Amino acid sequence: SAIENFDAHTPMMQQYLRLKAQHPEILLFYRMGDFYELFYDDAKRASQLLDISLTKRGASAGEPIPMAGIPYHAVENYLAKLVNQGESVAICEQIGDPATSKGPVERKVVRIVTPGTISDEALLQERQDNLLAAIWQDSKGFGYATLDISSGRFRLSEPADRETMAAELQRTNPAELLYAEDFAEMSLIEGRRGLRRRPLWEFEIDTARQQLNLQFGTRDLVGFGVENAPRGLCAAGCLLQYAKDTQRTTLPHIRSITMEREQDSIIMDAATRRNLEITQNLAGGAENTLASVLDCTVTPMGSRMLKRWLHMPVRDTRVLLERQQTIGALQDFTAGLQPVLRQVGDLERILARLALRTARPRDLARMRHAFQQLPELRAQLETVDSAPVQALREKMGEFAELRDLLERAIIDTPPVLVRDGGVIASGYNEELDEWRALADGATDYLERLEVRERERTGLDTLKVGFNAVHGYYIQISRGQSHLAPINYMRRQTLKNAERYIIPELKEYEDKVLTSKGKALALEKQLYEELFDLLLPHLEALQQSASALAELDVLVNLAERAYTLNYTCPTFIDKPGIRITEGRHPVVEQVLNEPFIANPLNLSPQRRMLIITGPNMGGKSTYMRQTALIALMAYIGSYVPAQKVEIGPIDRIFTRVGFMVEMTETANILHNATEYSLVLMDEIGRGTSTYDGLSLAWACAENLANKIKALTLFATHYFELTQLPEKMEGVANVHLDALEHGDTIAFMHSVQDGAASKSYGLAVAALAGVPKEVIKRARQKLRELESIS
Amino acid sequence: SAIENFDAHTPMMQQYLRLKAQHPEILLFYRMGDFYELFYDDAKRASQLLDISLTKRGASAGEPIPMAGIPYHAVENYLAKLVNQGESVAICEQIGDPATSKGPVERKVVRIVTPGTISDEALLQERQDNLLAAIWQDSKGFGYATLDISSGRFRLSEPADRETMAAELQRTNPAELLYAEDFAEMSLIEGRRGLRRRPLWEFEIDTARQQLNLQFGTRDLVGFGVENAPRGLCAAGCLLQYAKDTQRTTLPHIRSITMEREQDSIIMDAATRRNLEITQNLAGGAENTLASVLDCTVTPMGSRMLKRWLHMPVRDTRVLLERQQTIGALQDFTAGLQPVLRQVGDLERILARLALRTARPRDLARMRHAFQQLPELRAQLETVDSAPVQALREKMGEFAELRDLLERAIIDTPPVLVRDGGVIASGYNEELDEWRALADGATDYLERLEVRERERTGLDTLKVGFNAVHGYYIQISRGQSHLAPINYMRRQTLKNAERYIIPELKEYEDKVLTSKGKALALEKQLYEELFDLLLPHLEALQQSASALAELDVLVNLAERAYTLNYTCPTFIDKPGIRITEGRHPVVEQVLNEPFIANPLNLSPQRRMLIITGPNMGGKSTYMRQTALIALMAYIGSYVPAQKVEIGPIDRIFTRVGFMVEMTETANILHNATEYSLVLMDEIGRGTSTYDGLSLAWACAENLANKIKALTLFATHYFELTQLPEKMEGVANVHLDALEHGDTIAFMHSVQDGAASKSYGLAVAALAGVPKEVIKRARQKLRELESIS
DNA sequence: CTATAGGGCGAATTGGGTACCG
DNA sequence: CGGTACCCAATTCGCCCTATAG
Ligand SMILES: Nc1ncnc2c1ncn2[C@@H]1O[C@H](COP(=O)(O)OP(=O)(O)OP(=O)(O)O)[C@@H](O)[C@H]1O
Ligand SMILES: Nc1ncnc2c1ncn2[C@@H]1O[C@H](COP(=O)(O)OP(=O)(O)OP(=O)(O)O)[C@@H](O)[C@H]1O
């Protein structure tokens, strides 16, 4: 029974209706007492997801008001439930003091919790980076921006066309994606989690030019080389405004912008990245991954940087030569380095929470702790003789004065909430300890009087205690509550007792609660000053974290290299991969049986290898080993081979395993070049066998006559093995399974040629078919090959 | 630690050591209170599997004794755990009262719980038959015996050689298998669950001749035509003795022996069975099965008989013509038949438990209930005019006197255990009701006194109750346990009260528990008499169950026929299958879009059909449709086609898919004849395309030149399409997927010829490869078919 | 005696109670 | 003033646990 004109509503709902009207397409948490109350349609959705009982707010006005509510202290739990569902939610809070506000207390939206801007640790998987991005389409191309709000890392790109958008979208995997109403290609956008449609006026170039310059404080974006790419800047502006709108505050940690160049990275198509199983397998699990066997790192920061480095393999040689020399020098001390680096903690996400002024003292404990670990690191690092190691040593800095300030201004092990205090250490603010002296004077007076009044009145059941609602009392049991002096003022009546107050206790109760509130407000006001003291050096702290986890990677890649006997690979100028004693990493790390290793050669000349041989012969594992070495070479780490020599590579194509097969193949033969490594796993195997033949036969010839890429074709066809006689670049290689007696063995060893008579003609003799039938095959096997 | 000679042990362990010595190769459950205590090596194995804590019993003997124990009431749970692992276990009990043995109470093995003889319903999957078998090898041949202890159905066979042993072993799937120490072929035996080695003297012919005759009560086994097959009889004898030994009692339900003739059944090889997904899919589940679609049977017995019928398709025409006419006549009344037949219950397993004297009253409820449903069945069946229906009506019988006895001697809804009584109804034994009168006098006296003593003492918290260990008490709360009269004798010191006894209550508690034990022992003694009353007619009851579930099948098939439009198929004398509007049963029951139906013809002449065409085009499902029709023709049911004409069939060979492929192919081409239906599916799958070609090409030619069987070859190879020009009997059939514009359709329609241009050359244009690459395929697709 | 197995001893807690509140 | 935020308290349920005598 609801009429809802502006006037008809009560002053509290009039205030909410305007606040909800600002953000009407998203849910709101509205502070009231100790509960965030939801109303009408919002109360309905909340009841479905949060599974909280849908109730109705009392209709004093007249109109029905569907209502739901959740406790303020447990908000984060429900926020997590909503964030998994990709539900955007606004948080609004009482800004003014309700006593001084005659009308409804001044409420304002404090933050907008979106899947992109979740900076709260509870909502962030520790070894996964959370990202926020928007996307724009012009007739020529697309403007894709990204911001790691949890780090301040801000990126941008102008990818050429639709297929590269998908590669970028999977590689980023943005838990939240903003876009514009005019976006034409709606296949790519639909199905993405936390999908947001936006107004067109937000993607204006002029607004972006000014906004980006204002946030950085630099007059020209020329300082970061982004000026010459306006399409991407537009998305940045909306993202920066969206981030600003969602956090309602300045973002000074976001101090820079960078252009992710296609030229400066290996372009892996989305599909190739599903087959490599870099961090996530085909099944969607985190088992049998390159990451798991390459990852034994101490800090989550280090794992993320590793996962980023894997997704973004770098192409410049200088950066690789710098890293290898460092890892080689660290190898000896790894034993002493790994333990100290573990107590560093999540500095990157800590600094960002500090930047947003939303860091909590348990984070400040990890910060001072990391500050304590730095000097011993500097000591162990000083003895090391290599140029980048001393550079990394300088970059961590000292921050010793800040550590002293923290040790002076925080206790050793702090609580999670500032609301109850006991955070700041004793001797920093003499006034703090003056107010805490009255708090510690609670212990003695209460018991001292509890014995004093017990001695005076002569009542042995006399107990002094504190009730949150009734303040400080004296509890005389019902058996003695008639011998209580006239002085003892009745305060509360109980089941088995009676509670009394005197002006002396009331005077103590007044001074203690006031001194408490004085102590706590001072603690909060100083807790703000801690941010004010440390904010100046935030740029240097952000440089410190950018080196610490940049060291964690270099120490693990040394521990793994020493443990798995990996060797550093030299970079050469010509595209071409030469491997000696090659061992696939993931298999040789989950197999009781030893991995028989195999050398591989790829060159301007050894570009194409046809792989044949029996099923269950691991025809597949031989190729995955090359691609993963080629990837590891360009992350700058060592390789599980005696020696690897790598040539520069622009793109890695792969289709492990019809409609889906031709799409990714068509994609490769249009976008592959001379610097491309292609890895066909099965090809021309759709049906018929005279149809798939006319597909793959041509596919390889085009991959080795024009694209001139490198390929490790795995083909069941025995007719694609005549390519070397017809085409230059191709070379047959075969994985042979041996047969002694009635047992087949899996050698997974790689050699030259392939076998006309198959192990099948011999397998036919094992559990033998009638002798005429096996003879009849021999007659036909001879006939097929001979006529050809 | 001490000497372990016979004397050194304590009297209890001396008794156990001799008992264990009788059965030392199997575990024992030794009755020692609820916990059947297990010792030494047994305690070790128990701790590993039952996951019960391995402890050590005190060394009274002087040597440390390891020990485990499990409660008697929860034995069945641990028995199930052991049965799944195939672990045989003996159950021993204190049979003689403590007086029978001066030392430890007489203890005898009551039963040997083996995976074969599990008659307990809890250990039997309701819709799966449990079996028990032995196998001994002789120079002449193998003797394979089987006993369905849960039914009394006892079979025997003398299979020729090894390959048929495996087919029989899988078809039976004996949860347990017994064999002889001299057994040569140990590949077949190893890997089977609950594997048992036995002494040689058990497989003597003379002992078997006498033992089988003694059990049947027939002077000559000539009464069942088994005399002329001694090898099989030997295994029977051991099995009969093993069954006898395992149950320690007579087996009068096992009243007959039968020789399973290869001639009188369709011989399905083990492998074929796993592919047609008859009861169990490739994945091992019970979903998407012929069973799942053909099984809405109203009693599990009916599903088992269906599954048996499926697993043993019958060959004699008379039995089929009998069944079809019956199902056709039943079709009209199916609506009225299905509900009444549901209340029948598991009569077959019930009668066997009754026979073993191990039936439980919950089973007797289903028996009397089925007896009540018979007259209304006889009424509905009387109006039906067909010869076998009236014959089936006679076979169920009346058993009206037994129903009257059961209605007089069992209550409506009985409990599971006889241990607590309340089973037998009131008016049968006047002495029972005399003892039950004291039991029903428990309700009034307890509450009458509870108020009487409450009125006398003046204590309002006075409660009269019964604790199993402390007997009958009076509970006075701790607040009033000091006002309790001196008469009230303290019994139990409760945590919040005190429990008292007086001689009046004790006198009542004595007379009630004695009268209980008198009532209960009488209930058990009469519960024996129930078996003694029904045992004479057990042969007729076993004939009744053999018709009831044999009716459930004939009504379920009629229902599923009316619903899915199944039509009766005529039998012809020449082997050959003609199908019109053929509809595969499972897919048209799990597929949203319409299953398109398709006709098929198989004859002395149309014996071979090569199936080609696109992948995801049902190259495979159309062949599975024919085999399942051919099977369902020889179970005697209707078929999901307008009309089916079937010719007699001896064997259904089916390979659906290297080492494993050639074994079952070899097996077919040795054991296939003129009456064989073969379904090579994806054959010639040699990983080398050239290799597999030489294999299947010859396989088909041999299947159509000498074996002269019927085949539905599903082949990806497009070279096997030239057979009709080379070989008579072969005929190409193709399932075409259409391509109009940029959409591919799944017609699932069967026509003549094959598609030379494949959907792939068109699919290449969709999500198009470079125009040169698609052109290059055309060039090659033309080249491959033209050269041929 | 030496084991388990029903009995002893807490122990969390959830559906009401109880004001209450701008 | 119509729910609503805060407040229990006597349990049913979970976890020990401690007996003595053929
Ligand atoms: N170097 C090696 N040494 C020992 N075992 C190996 C080696 N490489 C692989 N294997 C094992 O042998 C198995 C071969 O089976 P797999 O299915 O991978 O064969 P495949 O020929 O790659 O199959 P497909 O032809 O379907 O791609 C692997 O799964 C792995 O367990
Ligand atoms: N009669 C039908 N009409 C329409 N769709 C069908 C029909 N039968 C099956 N389908 C659907 O089309 C799919 C075709 O795949 P299916 O596995 O049957 O192909 P197949 O050629 O038998 O495969 P394979 O050659 O690998 O054995 C089925 O999975 C099902 O979803």
Report how far residue A468's alpha carbon sits from residue A447's, in angstroms, rounded to the nearest whole number. Answer: 18
**How many CA atoms within 13 Å lie on the side-chain side of B299?**
30
Q: How was this structure determined?
A: cryo-EM
Distance CA A474, CA A459 (A): 11
Do A760 and A666 have their domain in common?
yes
Cβ–Cβ gap B770/A669 under 8 Å: yes
Check: CB of residue A632 under 8 Å from CB of residue A306: no
> Is residue B736 within 8 Å of residue B744, measured between CB atoms?
no
Query: HSE on the CB side for A573, CA within 13 Å?
Result: 0
Can you tell me which residue has the tokens 């159950």?
A: B91
Q: Are A331 and A562 in contact (CB under 8 A)?
A: yes
- Kindly determine whether residue B691 and residue A761, on different chains, have CB atoms separated by under 8 Å: yes
Q: State the greatest distance between any 2 C-alpha atoms of chain B, in Å, as a whole number.
A: 116
Residue B494 (CA) to nucleotide C19 (C1'), in angstroms, measures: 39
**A69 beta carbon to strand D: under 7 Å:** yes
Q: How far is CA A212 from CA A143, A218, A635, in A?
A: 15, 9, 31
Question: Rounded to whole angstroms, how far apart are CA atoms A310 and A171?
Answer: 10
- State the helix-helix crossing angle for B538-564 and B300-311, rounded to 10 degrees: 80
CB B93 within 8 A of CB B31: yes
Per DSSP, the three-state class of A465 is strand
Contact map slice: B 585-614 vs A, CB within 8 A? 612-614
Q: Reduce the secondary structure of B298-313 to three states and give it as a string.
A: CCHHHHHHHHHHHHCC
Alpha carbon of B640: minimum distance to chain A alpha carbons (Å):
30
Q: Are residues A577 and A719 in the same domain?
A: yes
The dihedrals phi and psi of B60, each to the nearest 5 degrees, come to: -65, -40
Calculate ∠ Cα B614-B617-B619, nearest 5°.
85
CA nearest ligand 2 atom 1, residue: B595
Cα separation of A243 and A215, whole Å? 12
With CA atoms as reference, report the closest residue to A393 among A185, A544, A209. A544
Is B279 in contact with B291 (CB distance < 8 Å)? Answer: yes
Cα A749 to Cα B276: distance, rounded to the nearest angstrom: 38
Nucleotides, chain D, CB distance < 7 Å: 1-7, 9
Task: Report d(CA B476, CA B469) in Å as an integer.
Answer: 19
How long is the CA A85 to C1' C21 vector, in angstroms?
Answer: 36
| B536: Cβ contacts below 8 Å, ≥ 6 apart | none
Distance CA A99, CA A317 (A): 67
Q: Residue B503: which residues within 8 A CB-CB, separation 6 or more?
A: none
Task: Count Cβ atoms within 10 A of the Cβ of residue A627 and give its class: 0-12 exposed, 13-18 middle, 19 or more buried.
Answer: buried
Q: How far apart are CA B171 and CA B548, in angstroms?
A: 25
In this structure, the answer to whether residues A106 and A238 fall within a common structural domain is no
- Protein-contacted bases of chain C (C-beta within 7 A): 1-10, 22
Gyration radius (Cα) of chain B, Å? 34
Report the phi/psi class of residue B458: left, alpha or beta, with left for phi > 0 and alpha for psi in -120 to 50. Answer: left
A 490-519 residues, CB < 7 A, strand D: 495
Compute the radius of gyration of chain A from its Cα atoms.
35
Two tokens, residue A705: 């006559």
Q: Which phi and psi angles does A699 have, rounded to 5°?
A: -60, -45
B185 C-beta neighbours (distance < 10 Å), count = 13
Specify the DSSP class assigned to residue A304.
H
Ligand showing the shortest atom-to-Cα distance for residue A582: 1
Closest ligand 2 atom, CA of B584? 1
The SS3 call for residue A615 is coil
CB contact under 8 Å between B687 and A761, yes or no, is no
Q: Which of A478, A479, A488, A498 is nearest to A456 (CA)?
A: A488
Please tell me if the CB atom of residue B595 comes closer than 6 angstroms to any atom of ligand 2: yes
B16/B103 Cα distance (integer angstroms): 12
Whether residue B691 and residue A717 make contact (CB cut-off 8 A), yes or no, is: no
AA identity, residue A550 = E
Question: Tokens at residue B696, please?
Answer: 């299947």
- For residue B130, give the DSSP letter: -
Distance A494 CA to D8 C1' (A): 13
Same domain, B626 and B694: yes
Q: Where are the beta strands (DSSP E) in A558-714?
A: 570-571, 578-582, 598-601, 608-612, 643-646, 651-655, 676-680, 710-711
Structural domain of B765: 570-785
Return d(Cα A526, Cα A520) in angstroms, integer.
Answer: 10
A423-441 in b/e form (b: 16+ CB < 10 A) is: bbeeebbeebbebbebbee
Residue A562 in contact with partner chain B when CB distance is under 8 A: no
Could you count the other beta carbons within 10 Å of the beta carbon of residue A204? Answer: 12
B705 Cβ contacts chain C strand, under 7 Å:
no
Angstrom distance, A536 CA to D21 C1': 82
CA distance A393 to A544: 9
- Give the nearest nucleotide to A71, CA to C1': D5
| Cα separation, B775 vs B239, whole angstroms | 71
Strand order in the sheet with B65-68: B38-39, B65-68, B55-57
Interface-testing mutation among B757, B769, B782, B787, with chain A (most A C-beta atoms within 10 A)? B769
The three-point CA angle B180-B185-B189 to 5° equals 65
User: Cα separation of A710 and A540, whole Å?
Assistant: 44
CA–CA distance, B259 with A601 (Å, rounded to integer): 67
Q: How many C-beta atoms lie closer than 10 Å to residue A482's C-beta? A: 8
Record: contact A694-B784, CB cut-off 8 A: yes
Q: B585-615 burial, b if ≥16 CB within 10 A, otherwise e?
A: bbbbbeeeeebebbebebbeebbbbbbbbbb
Considering every ligand atom shown, identify the ligand nearest to the alpha carbon of residue B617 and give its number: 2
Q: Which of A688, A761, A776 sits opposite B718 (nearest CB)?
A: A688
Angle in degrees, 0-180, between the axes of helices B538-564 and B317-330, rounded to the nearest 10: 70
Nearest CA to ligand 1 atom 22: A618
Torsion of CA B668, B674, B680, B684, to 10 degrees: 70
- Alpha-carbon distance A320 to A328, whole Å? 12
Based on the number of CB atoms within 10 Å of its own CB, is A268 exposed (0-12), middle (13-18) or buried (19 or more)?
A: buried
Please name which of A122, A92, A117, A86 lies closest in space to residue A104, comparing C-alpha atoms: A92
DSSP-based three-state secondary structure for B582: strand
Q: Which two tokens stand for residue B208?
A: 């078997």
Copy the structure tokens of residue A777: 């095959």
C8 closest protein residue (CA to C1'): B495
Please name which of B482, B484, B486 lies closest in space to residue B463, comparing C-alpha atoms: B484
Residue with tokens 């009982």: A53
Q: Which two tokens stand for residue A191?
A: 């199905």
> 3-class SS at A379?
helix
Specify the CATH number for the domain of residue A609.
3.40.50.300
Beta-strand pair A676-680/A651-655: parallel
Beta strand A578-582 with A643-646 is antiparallel
Residue A767 has its nearest CB partner, among B663, B694, B784, at B663
Instruction: Tell me how far apart the alpha carbons of residues A254 and A239 are, in angstroms, rounded to a whole number.
Output: 12
- In angstroms, rounded to a whole number, what is the distance separating the alpha carbons of residues B93 and B32? 9
Amino acid at site B270? A
Q: Where does residue B519 rank: exposed (0-12), middle (13-18), buried (19+ CB within 10 A)?
A: buried
Report d(CA A120, CA A247) in Å as an integer: 12
Least CB–CB distance from A691: residue in B658, B761, B783: B761
DSSP B164: H
B281 contact partners, CB below 8 Å, separation of at least 6: B287, B288, B289
At what angle are helices B162-172 and B659-671 packed, to 10 degrees? 110
Contacts of B546 (CB under 8 A, 6+ apart): B348, B395
d(CA B323, CA B325): 6
What pairs with residue A570 in β-bridges? A645
**Cα B675 to Cα B673: distance, rounded to the nearest angstrom:** 6
Residues A659 and B767: beta-carbon distance below 8 Å: yes
Alpha carbons A753 and A613: distance in angstroms, whole number:
10
**Angstrom distance, A71 CA to C12 C1':** 21
B582 and B650 share a domain? Answer: yes
Ligand 2 neighbour B596 (Cβ under 6 A): yes
Closest partner residue to A662 (CB to CB) among B689, B691, B769 is: B769
Residues contacting residue A787 through CB under 8 Å, at least 6 positions apart: none
User: What CATH number corresponds to the domain at position B194?
Assistant: 3.30.420.110
Is A731 in a helix, a strand, or coil?
Answer: strand
Q: Secondary structure of B481-513 in the HEC alphabet? A: CCCCCCCCEEEECCCCEEEEECHHHHHHHHHHH
Question: What are residue B738's phi and psi, to 5 degrees?
Answer: -85, 155
Same domain, B777 and B644: yes
Q: B776 and A692 in contact by Cβ < 8 A?
A: no
Is A86 annotated in a binding site? The answer is no
A620 carries a ligand binding annotation = yes
Do residues A668 and A653 make contact, with C-beta atoms less than 8 angstroms apart? yes
| Measured distance CA(B478)–CA(B498) in Å, rounded | 6
From B696, which residue of chain A is nearest by alpha-carbon distance?
A777
Q: Are A98 and A105 in contact, with CB atoms under 8 Å apart?
A: yes
User: Going by DSSP bridges, is the β-strand pair A730-740/A743-752 parallel, antiparallel, or unpaired?
Assistant: antiparallel
Tell me the CA–centroid distance for residue A622 and ligand 1, in Å: 9
* Alpha carbon distances (Å) from A766 to A106, A616, A759, B401, B659: 87, 17, 11, 65, 8
Query: Based on the number of CB atoms within 10 Å of its own CB, is A356 exposed (0-12), middle (13-18) or buried (19 or more)?
Result: buried
Residues B771 and B709 in one domain: yes
- Give the full edge-to-edge strand order of the sheet including B154-157: B195-198, B177-180, B132-137, B142-147, B154-157, B258-259
Contact between B304 and B332 (Cβ < 8 Å): no
What is the rounded distance in angstroms from the CA atom of residue A760 to the CA atom of residue A766? 9
CA atoms within 13 A on the CB side of A607: 25
Q: Is the CB of B469 under 7 A from strand C?
A: yes
Strand B132-137 with B142-147, pairing: antiparallel
Give the C-alpha separation, A14 to A11, whole Å: 5
What's the CA-to-centroid distance between B696 and ligand 2, angstroms?
A: 23
In angstroms, the CA B418 to CA B415 distance is 8
Round to whole Å and give the CA distance between A669 and A695.
13
The tokens for A277 are: 């199983």
Cβ atoms of residues B179 and B144 within 8 Å:
no
Q: Identify whether residues A668 and A599 lie together within a single domain.
A: yes
Identify whether residues B656 and B721 lie together within a single domain: yes
A217 touches strand D (CB under 7 A): no
A394 touching chain B per CB within 8 A: no
Residue A693 touches chain B, beta carbons under 8 Å: yes
Taking Cα atoms as reference points, which of A310, A659, A587 lies closest to residue B767? A659
Residues B30 and B136 in one domain: no
The strand D neighbours among A residues 152-211, by Cβ under 7 Å, are none
User: First vs last Cα of chain A: how many Å apart?
Assistant: 87
* Window A:631-690, CB contacts with B under 8 Å: 658-659, 662-663, 665-666, 669-670, 686-690
- Ligand 1 binding pocket (C-beta < 6 A) is A 587, 591, 593, 595-596, 615-621, 746, 748
Q: Is A161 exposed, middle or buried (0-12, 13-18, 19+ CB in 10 A)?
A: exposed
How far is A266 from A258, CA to CA, in rounded Å? Answer: 17
Q: CA B350, B352, B355 angle in degrees (round to 5)?
A: 115
Q: Probe ligand 2: pick from B581, B746, B747, B759, max atoms within 8 Å of CB?
A: B746
Q: Which residues have CB under 8 Å from A512's CB, separation 6+?
A: A438, A439, A441, A442, A472
Size of interface A-B (CB pairs under 8 A): 171
- Say yes or no for a CB contact (<8 Å) between A776 and B701: yes
Q: Mark yes or no for CB contact B766/A692 under 8 Å.
A: no
Provide the token pair at B402.
């037994």
Instruction: Give yes or no: residues B207 and B109 share one domain.
Output: no
- Taking the C-alpha atoms of residue A673 and residue A709, their distance in angstroms, rounded to an integer, is 6
Is the Cβ atom of B620 under 6 angstroms away from ligand 2?
yes
The last residues before gaps in chain B (C-N over 2.5 Å) are 657
Q: How remote is the CA of residue A587 from the centroid of ligand 1, in Å?
A: 9
| Residues B91 and B113 sit within 8 Å (Cβ to Cβ) | yes
Ligand 2 pocket member B589 (CB < 6 A) = no
Q: How many residues comprise chain B? A: 788
Of B residues 50-69, those with CB within 7 angstroms of nucleic strand C are: 55-60, 67-69
Q: Can you read off the two tokens belonging to residue B92?
A: 């021993």
Half-sphere exposure of B383 (CA within 13 A, CB side): 9
Token pair, residue B280, equals 């169990």
Distance of CA A100 to the CA centre of its chain: 44
Q: What number of CA atoms fall less than 13 Å from residue B400's CA on the CB side?
A: 4
Spell out the residues 6+ positions from residue A59 whose beta carbon is closer than 8 angstroms to its own: A1, A65
Q: Which residues of A touch B617 (CB under 8 A)?
A: 687
Half-sphere exposure of B355 (CA within 13 A, CB side): 25
Alpha helices in A38-191 (DSSP H): 40-49, 75-84, 162-172, 186-189
Work out whether the CA dihedral A317, A322, A325, A327 comes out positive or negative: negative
Q: Which helix (H) or strand (E) holds A500?
A: strand A497-501
A100 CB neighbours strand C below 7 A: no
Tell me the CATH number at A23: 3.40.1170.10
Q: Measured on CA atoms in the order B338, B344, B345, B347, is the torsion positive or negative? A: negative
Q: How long is chain A?
A: 788
| Contacts with A311 (C-beta within 8 Å, 6 or more apart), sequence order | A171, A273, A278, A279
Tell whether A619 and A697 lie within a shared domain.
yes
Tell me B757's DSSP state.
S
